[PDB]
Design a protein around this ligand. Structure first.
Ligand SMILES: [Mg+2]
Ligand SMILES: [Mg+2]
Ligand SMILES: [Mg+2]
Ligand SMILES: [Mg+2]
Ligand SMILES: [Mg+2]
Ligand SMILES: [Mg+2]
Ligand SMILES: [Mg+2]
Ligand SMILES: [Mg+2]
Ligand SMILES: [Mg+2]
Ligand SMILES: [Mg+2]
Ligand SMILES: [Mg+2]
Ligand SMILES: [Mg+2]
Lengths: 141, 179, 55, 125
RNA sequence: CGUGCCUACCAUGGUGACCACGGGUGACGGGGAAUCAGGGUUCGAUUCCGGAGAGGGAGCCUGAGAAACGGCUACCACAUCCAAGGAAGGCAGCAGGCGCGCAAAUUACCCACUCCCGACCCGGGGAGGUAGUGACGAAAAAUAACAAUACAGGACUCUUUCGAGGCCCUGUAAUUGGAAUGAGUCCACUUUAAAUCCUUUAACGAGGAUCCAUUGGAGGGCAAGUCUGGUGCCAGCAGCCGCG
């Protein structure tokens, strides 16, 4: 079914170069919509300042009220629904604080419990959330 | 701009599967048998043995009368004899591939100390080779990861030291306590 | 939602326990010595049908 | 106590000098300083001690040999001429007396701004 | 200097489905780097070669070599001192400052080494070298160890041994040493243009108040608890299945 002659390498590179676009990973890696569509400008982390604190509902088999921080960016200016990771930290994240955000496990999908949140809170005003969830490095007053 | 040095070798192999029960048991009994600190210095010996195996298979790929094969094979046999893994008997290139991991660990410093005395419990021989008490030759040896070459293999002395060399490094504390 | 301020409930209602004085932990070469001597010298009387590494 | 020997030896009769590599053996105390090795090498060469220079000293990690480079000369005028001023500074034959930063560059600037009699007035004083 | 590089005339030509022409590149081109059957895939701004540029872009003197910018002239956008008539500027150099961003070093010393410029053995060089921050990353590696006495939890040689232990792992907050050596406290060396750091040596320098090893996990993948007490689809955990 293939083409296997000694002068067919142009036909091969043309056919594979056409069929290589049908993979999701190649087109999301080499098409500009993964720069001009997502936030971060194609980055891993970005600062942001809190707009509001919204509780979202979880999925159907898991009944939980997840806590989320609507983040106004500094670089791009988009509105990002983040996620407060740990048990407390809602009392530690106040209104209009500098918040560093990241991903969960994948840029494309989200966590199977939270419906529409791709992003996760890392820092609270240049002091990280792991210290605030532990006992050291309390916030400035 | 600057021109000093830019080179980087990683004598360090992390295996693909991180958690294998039989392999972790083998590595733990290997460390407990040959007196080591962590598994990165097991992986050093694994990487050196694997590099020797890759070079040996690259030599065995070529034809028998090839000059590069003859030169590099004779040099590799000479280097393995000067290390002390092989003998002066079988000089076959597949006899290089017929080697295990424990041969270089036997040809380390403190295992040759265990074979030729003054070791006294390898876990104490770690301290005996960290502190200046076991000295292969006039150039002082301090580092545990040291390959004992077969050319001398016996010059294990120590001079100007605590048990035989002399001096009062810390027995002056006990003598001032008794005085 | 109205119940948004249910935060830190478990860490506010969980009773604290004082961490008691634990001895120092031997590390590195000593830790590998005790890991070898925990499961490679005096375990083979207990036969390998049943396993008891933690209980 | 100590033992001073040579390893490599060269002779440059163009400059009337003899170069050598010096190993000093130590089964005992610490690294012997600049003065005593120079005095013992002057005694072994059987001339005046104010002519032999030496530089560099290593240590082979506990006793052993210490390695350096020794310059044995025969003429003190050739010693003052051929040796650089930084190796005259070990005995204090050359002194600069102003080892300060930006003095040369600020004199260049004050001679770059004004020109002539005012330049000779400000830049020299 | 050969050239449609330019000019006058004449002919209508030249390229292309073997991708011409036009667009985008978060495209400087390579030697190379990462990735371990082989074939491949992705980067390469970056120390070496070559090219381009000195906010954009045009013109030019000198000079063999420049359309140079730590050279000049004019325009646009900035921007300094004015006593308001005029002057003076280009850190994508070395430090450093502002902004930007998740993101990156000190207004240090020296021409001592390497070479480079100049009339010259003699001057100079933020080119460079040394030092400071530095867990980008790489190499070696103690972290409390070890050989001793004894209660033995007792596996093992073998004799009714309810043990003779010249083999033994281990809890020993039980004792004794090399009182080791290492980190730090620091004389004198040494290195160095002057120092610092590597190493050497003099005196100090451990017995759980030690001189303190953390980072994640313990349902399967994936190593490890059907331990205890609260929380009771709430908090939450979990990258996937799932638990509450
Ligand atoms: Mg996912
Ligand atoms: Mg570009
Ligand atoms: Mg590879
Ligand atoms: Mg390949
Ligand atoms: Mg060209
Ligand atoms: Mg240019
Ligand atoms: Mg220039
Ligand atoms: Mg400039
Ligand atoms: Mg600029
Ligand atoms: Mg956890
Ligand atoms: Mg398991
Ligand atoms: Mg996780």
């Amino acid at each position: 079914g293939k083409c296997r002659g000694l002068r067919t390498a142009r036909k091969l590179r043309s056919h594979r170069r056409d069929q290589k676009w049908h993979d999701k990973q190649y087109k999301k890696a080499h098409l500009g919509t993964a720069l001009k569509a997502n936030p971060f400008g194609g980055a891993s982390h970005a600062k942001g300042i809190v707009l509001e604190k919204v509780g979202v509902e979880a999925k159907q088999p898991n009944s939980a009220i997840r806590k989320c921080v609507r983040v106004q960016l500094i670089k791009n200016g988009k509105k990002i629904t983040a996620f407060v990771p740990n048990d407390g930290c809602l009392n530690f994240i106040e209104e209009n604080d500098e918040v560093l955000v990241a991903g969960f496990g994948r840029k494309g999908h989200a966590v199977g419990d939270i419906p529409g949140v791709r992003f996760k809170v890392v820092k609270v005003a240049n002091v990280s959330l792991l210290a605030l969830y532990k006992g050291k490095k309390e916030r400035p007053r | 701009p600057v021109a000093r040095s830019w080179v980087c070798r990683k004598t360090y192999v992390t295996p693909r599967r991180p958690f294998e029960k039989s392999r972790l048991d083998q590595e733990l009994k290997l460390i407990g048998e040959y007196g080591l600190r962590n598994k990165r210095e097991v992986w050093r010996v694994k990487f050196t043995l694997a590099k020797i195996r890759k070079a040996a298979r690259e030599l065995l790929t070529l034809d028998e009368k090839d000059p590069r094969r003859l030169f590099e094979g004779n040099a590799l046999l000479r280097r393995l004899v000067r290390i002390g893994v092989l003998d002066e008997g079988k000089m076959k290139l597949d006899y290089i591939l017929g080697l295990k991991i424990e041969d270089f660990l036997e040809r380390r410093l403190q295992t040759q100390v265990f074979k030729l005395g003054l070791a006294k419990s390898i876990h104490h021989a770690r301290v005996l080779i960290r502190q200046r008490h076991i000295r292969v030759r006039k150039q002082v040896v301090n580092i545990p990861s040291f390959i004992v070459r077969l050319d001398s293999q016996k010059h294990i002395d120590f001079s100007l030291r605590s048990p035989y060399g002399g001096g009062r490094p810390g027995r002056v504390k006990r003598k001032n306590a008794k005085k | 939602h109205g119940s948004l301020a249910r935060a830190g409930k478990v860490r506010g209602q969980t009773p604290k326990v004082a961490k008691q004085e634990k001895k120092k932990k031997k590390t590195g070469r000593a830790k590998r010595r005790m890991q070898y001597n925990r499961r490679f010298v005096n375990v083979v009387p207990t036969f390998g049908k049943k396993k008891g590494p933690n209980a | 106590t100590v033992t001073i020997r040579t390893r490599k030896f060269m002779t440059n009769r163009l400059l009337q000098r003899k170069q050598m590599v010096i190993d000093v053996l130590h089964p005992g105390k610490a690294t012997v300083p600049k003065t005593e090795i120079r005095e013992k090498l002057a005694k072994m060469y059987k001339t005046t001690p104010d002519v032999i220079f030496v530089f560099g000293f290593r240590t082979h990690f506990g006793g052993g040999k210490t390695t350096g480079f020794g310059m044995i000369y025969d003429s003190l005028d050739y010693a003052k001429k051929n040796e650089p001023k930084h190796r005259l500074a070990r005995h204090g034959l050359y002194e600069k007396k102003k080892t300060s930063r930006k003095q040369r560059k600020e004199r260049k600037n004050r001679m770059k701004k004004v020109r002539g009699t005012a330049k000779a007035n400000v830049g020299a004083g």
